Design a binder for this molecule. Structure first.
Ligand code: CLA
Ligand code: CLA
Ligand SMILES: CCCCCCCCCCCCCCCCCC(=O)OC[C@H](CO[C@@H]1O[C@H](CO)[C@H](O)[C@H](O)[C@H]1O)OC(=O)CCCCCCCCCCCCCCCCC
Ligand SMILES: CCCCCCCCCCCCCCCCCC(=O)OC[C@H](CO[C@@H]1O[C@H](CO)[C@H](O)[C@H](O)[C@H]1O)OC(=O)CCCCCCCCCCCCCCCCC
Ligand SMILES: CC/C=C/C/C=C\C/C=C/CCCCCCCC(=O)O
Ligand SMILES: CC/C=C\C/C=C\C/C=C\CCCCCCCC(=O)O
Lengths: 238, 34, 144, 60, 51, 188
């Protein structure tokens, strides 16, 4: 980060263009009170909710420990401009729900062995609740590829060949029955958010997040891996 | 990555300066004509 | 397939993109210049909305030092202001339209100065230019 | 962010210089080659057996 | 006869091969062992369909 | 031999309206001249089908089906009539699965139809008509959607229906004129 919302809005597009400052989340100023602060309990309209990751770890299927990864797709992995609702109770319990905005970004990373691991970084339909110390919830992870995506050989779920057109002699291809079927089914993930600062003067919040989800499976043709994503986040309450 | 950029800049400017100052060194006079 | 009721989309302006691409229609109809001249109510409403937006939003953005937002606002909805002013002033007698043209030219010079100051990122100069622009816009609106 | 990069592509810098070290490298190498050429340009001219007057050069 | 049925096969058609597809047709299609039968396709109303 | 001289120095074009009139069994319409006859029967009761030379997506079809009712309104409301005849836009029966990765589509749906306009009107003779205008979109989104124009009526105990299809890509490039002309010329 190292820039606030006012500082970011004080620039020009020609000055931000190319500096990778558009892939980062703003931070709060010195006026921010620690933790929940002095926010009046109630339901607010969430806006400008963004999450900037700071580390990716991959646990390959068959391993019990996460591993570091190297990003391959440059600065395209920040979710931003999400909108929703935030409710604060008198005790201190907070509930966050995400409705719209850019809540998904495909990401590809490489691991120690040399295997690229695509995954679909998303917090779509986020539903978390708990104290300001930590909010535990879940989200839905849509398929990496759509239903109309066609593989190299022209096989897709809702459009494409249902078999291998190259091998004409093999009438049924019972050996290839596994790879001829495509399923773009969705899954779910888990999240653990926290709140570190709050400014009731302008209705701004910030904290950290840790999420766990699954990699892609090439439309049901692979065993997905588990990826842990951690970083910071920011949002505005109004 | 900055070290690689510096090294490449040095190499490129070396070769281009060689080209320029070689073609400035009375090149038209190097012919077999009388 | 599965039916959906979207009959109210046409009332929301669904045919604007299809009419703008109709090569049979004249260029004035495609660009919307013919409709505004035929119906001056749209021009008057656009002028009033542009004035109100200029006042409130320019004050807010210059106060908070939002230069990009200020310039975009100056050319997002106000983008038809010159054409609307010309169309309104063309329906006036010779002397009245001449005075309106002079006032409009002065106002446009004021807006140009304000945009220059916003680009140069000055606060007090931009505020003074904005006050002058508001005064000139009020004068040209009263002239029409 | 996850990693770090120069982040200079598509910016519009003069000769692509984001650090003064590139300027120093360019200037030093150019000056060295120019000085080497400048020392010898007097000897090189004398190989034509002619003086560098107003009529010097390849002319037609 | 199964011979007459086998003669009606585009796999046995000679203009379906390749220049660098070496070997016998048994190396590309497999050794035939039996005739499945004449497949007849019918509509839901009973009308015949032909491929 | 024929003996007919060539039309040299002729300043008149035989046909320039862009349409060719057609006289059928109980109906008449103006078919675009650039279209060709087709041998496809996708819906029950197809008695006429024409498709464009440059694109097979643009086509029209006329259905004459047998019904008991002698009037169109006895088949239900225009919304109910359109709901009953929803097979005219096709079905996603071959796609049997669940998905959540579509752009602007409901879950497990790879196609949708937007009813842009409905209308009920009577001709000069005095026969009621049901006019529809739909835009069907696909998950992949070929041609940027398809425009379906439907006009249905009942005469002598039979339902007469016409559906005119035109891809959006061709629709906004100037081919909407032919489709609208064929749709508006349907007389029974
Ligand atoms: C403090 C920096 C500085 C230095 C070191 C010099 C030095 C020199 N000047 Mg002057 N000059 C300066 C400032 C400086 N100038 C400025 C600001 C102006 C603008 C008005 C001029 C205008 C000027 C003119 C118009 C001319 C000179 C000339 C000369 C050269 C005369 C000796 C020669 O004939 O050898 C022959 C020279 C060589 C074989 C080059 C040998 C390589 C050495 C290392 C050169 C030093 C280069 C560089 C400036 C070093 C910077 C030092 C710093 C990085 C530590 C000599 C290189 C004359 C010259 O010969 O021009 C080429 C000449 O005609 N100067
Ligand atoms: C003159 C014509 C002729 C014909 C029509 C046949 C026909 C047949 N042969 Mg017989 N054969 C011949 C001569 C011929 N043969 C000769 C002269 C020999 C002695 C070497 C053999 C030895 C022989 C063996 C050992 C076998 C056959 C088999 C077969 C059958 C398989 C065909 C095949 O796969 O070829 C495919 C041929 C090619 C891909 C080469 C075509 C030439 C291309 C266009 C150019 C290559 C040139 C280039 C410079 C090569 C560079 C080499 C390097 C770069 C790798 C087929 C019925 C096979 C079989 O089924 O047996 C039961 C088998 O196993 N043949
Ligand atoms: C102008 C003096 C010429 C003197 C004689 C020269 C003779 C020929 C010498 C060789 C030339 C070819 C090789 C050059 C290699 C080095 C350059 C290079 O790779 O730069 C590549 C670099 C790329 O710089 C990039 O910049 C990015 C940010 O913008 C990032 O920082 C990148 O990291 C960085 O690499 O570009 C430059 O250095 C810009 C050069 C601008 C040159 C302007 C010349 C103006 C005067 C001439 C106008 C006409 C020119 C021709 C137009 C028509 C052509 C059909
Ligand atoms: C001196 C050089 C010697 C070697 C020269 C290079 C030979 C290259 C071709 C070899 C055959 C293909 C590769 C291979 O091993 O396949 C392997 C195959 C056979 O090998 C195996 O055989 C088994 C049965 O024993 C099964 O059939 C297997 O499927 C099959 O793979 O080899 C051949 O078919 C050899 C064919 C040789 C004769 C060619 C017939 C066509 C002649 C055309 C003449 C005109 C050409 C154009 C005009 C010029
Ligand atoms: C004088 C000319 C020199 C010739 C020497 C020849 C080849 C040297 C090649 C250099 C290219 C290196 C590319 C990789 C740099 C390191 C990248 C990294 O950070 O891992
Ligand atoms: C002895 C004094 C005489 C002459 C010296 C005069 C001027 C020197 C000025 C500048 C030298 C450094 C130039 C740096 C260029 C920009 C580098 C960058 O963009 O980082």
């Amino acid at each position: 980060g190292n820039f606030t919302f006012d500082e970011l809005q004080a620039k020009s597009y020609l000055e931000v263009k190319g500096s990778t400052l558009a892939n980062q989340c703003p931070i709060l100023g010195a006026d921010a009170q620690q933790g929940l602060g002095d926010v009046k309990p109630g339901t607010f309209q969430l806006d400008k909710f963004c999450m900037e990751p700071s580390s990716f770890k991959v646990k390959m299927p068959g391993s019990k420990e996460f591993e570091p990864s190297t990003l391959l797709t440059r600065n395209t992995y920040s979710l931003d401009q999400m909108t929703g609702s935030v409710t604060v109770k008198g005790d201190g319990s907070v509930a966050l729900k995400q409705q719209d905005g850019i809540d998904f970004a495909p990401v590809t990373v490489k691991i120690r062995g040399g295997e690229m691991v695509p995954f679909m970084f998303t917090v779509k339909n986020l539903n978390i609740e708990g104290k300001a110390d930590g909010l535990t919830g879940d989200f839905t992870v849509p398929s990496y590829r759509g239903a109309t995506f066609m593989d190299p050989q022209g096989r897709g779920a809702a459009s494409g060949w249902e078999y291998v057109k190259g091998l004409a002699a093999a009438g049924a291809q019972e050996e290839l029955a596994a790879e001829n079927v495509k399923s773009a089914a969705a899954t779910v993930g888990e999240a653990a958010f926290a709140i570190a600062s709050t400014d009731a003067a302008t209705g701004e919040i910030a904290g950290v997040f840790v999420t766990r989800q699954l990699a892609d499976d090439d439309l049901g043709s692979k065993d997905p891996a588990t990826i842990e994503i951690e970083g910071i986040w920011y949002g505005q309450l109004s | 990555m900055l070290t690689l950029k510096i090294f490449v800049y040095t190499v490129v400017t070396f070769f281009v300066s060689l080209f320029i100052f070689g073609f400035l060194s009375n090149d038209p006079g190097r012919n077999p004509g009388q | 397939l599965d039916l959906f009721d979207d009959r109210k989309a046409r009332q929301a302006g669904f045919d604007i993109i299809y009419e703008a691409r109709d090569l049979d229609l004249p260029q004035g109809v495609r660009d919307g210049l013919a409709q505004a001249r035929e119906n001056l109510d749209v021009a008057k409403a656009r002028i009033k909305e542009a004035e109100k937006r200029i006042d409130a939003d320019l004050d807010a953005y210059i106060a908070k030092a939002y230069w990009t937002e200020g310039r975009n606002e100056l050319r997002r909805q106000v983008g038809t202001l010159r054409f609307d002013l010309n169309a309104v002033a063309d329906t006036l007698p010779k002397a009245a339209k001449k005075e309106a043209q002079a006032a409009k030219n002065e106002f446009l010079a004021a807006v140009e100065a304000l945009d220059l100051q916003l680009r140069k990122k000055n606060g007090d100069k931009a505020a003074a230019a904005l006050a002058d622009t508001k005064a000139k816009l009020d004068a040209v609106i009263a002239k029409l | 962010l996850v990693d770090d990069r120069l982040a200079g592509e598509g910016t519009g810098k003069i000769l692509g210089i984001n650090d003064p070290s590139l300027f120093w490298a360019i200037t030093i190498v150019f000056t060295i080659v120019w000085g080497v050429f400048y020392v010898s340009t007097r000897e090189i001219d004398a190989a034509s057996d002619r003086e560098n007057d107003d009529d010097f050069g390849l002319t037609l | 006869p199964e011979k007459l049925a086998f003669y009606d096969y585009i796999g046995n058609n000679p203009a379906k091969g390749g220049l660098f597809r070496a070997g016998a047709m048994n190396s590309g299609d497999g050794i035939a062992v039996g005739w499945l039968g004449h497949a007849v396709f019918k509509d839901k109303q009973g009308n015949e369909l032909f491929v | 031999a024929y003996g007919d001289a060539a039309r040299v120095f002729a300043g008149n074009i035989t046909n320039k309206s862009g349409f060719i009139p057609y006289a059928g069994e109980g109906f008449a319409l103006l078919i675009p001249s650039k279209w060709n006859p087709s041998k496809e029967q996708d819906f029950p009761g197809v008695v006429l089908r024409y498709e464009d030379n440059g694109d097979a997506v643009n086509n029209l079809v006329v259905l004459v089906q047998k019904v008991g009712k002698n009037n169109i309104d006895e088949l239900g409301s225009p919304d109910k009539f359109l709901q009953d005849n929803a097979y005219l836009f096709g079905e996603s029966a071959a796609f049997t699965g669940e998905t959540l990765s579509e752009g602007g589509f409901l879950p497990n749906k790879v196609a949708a139809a937007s009813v842009l306009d409905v209308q009920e009107a009577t001709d000069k003779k005095g026969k009621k008509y049901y006019k529809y205008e739909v835009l069907t979109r696909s998950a992949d989104g070929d041609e940027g959607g398809r425009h379906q124009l439907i006009a249905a009526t009942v005469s002598n105990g039979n339902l007469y229906l016409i559906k005119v299809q035109c891809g959006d890509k061709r629709w906004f490039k100037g081919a909407k004129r032919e489709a609208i002309g064929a749709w508006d010329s349907f007389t029974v």
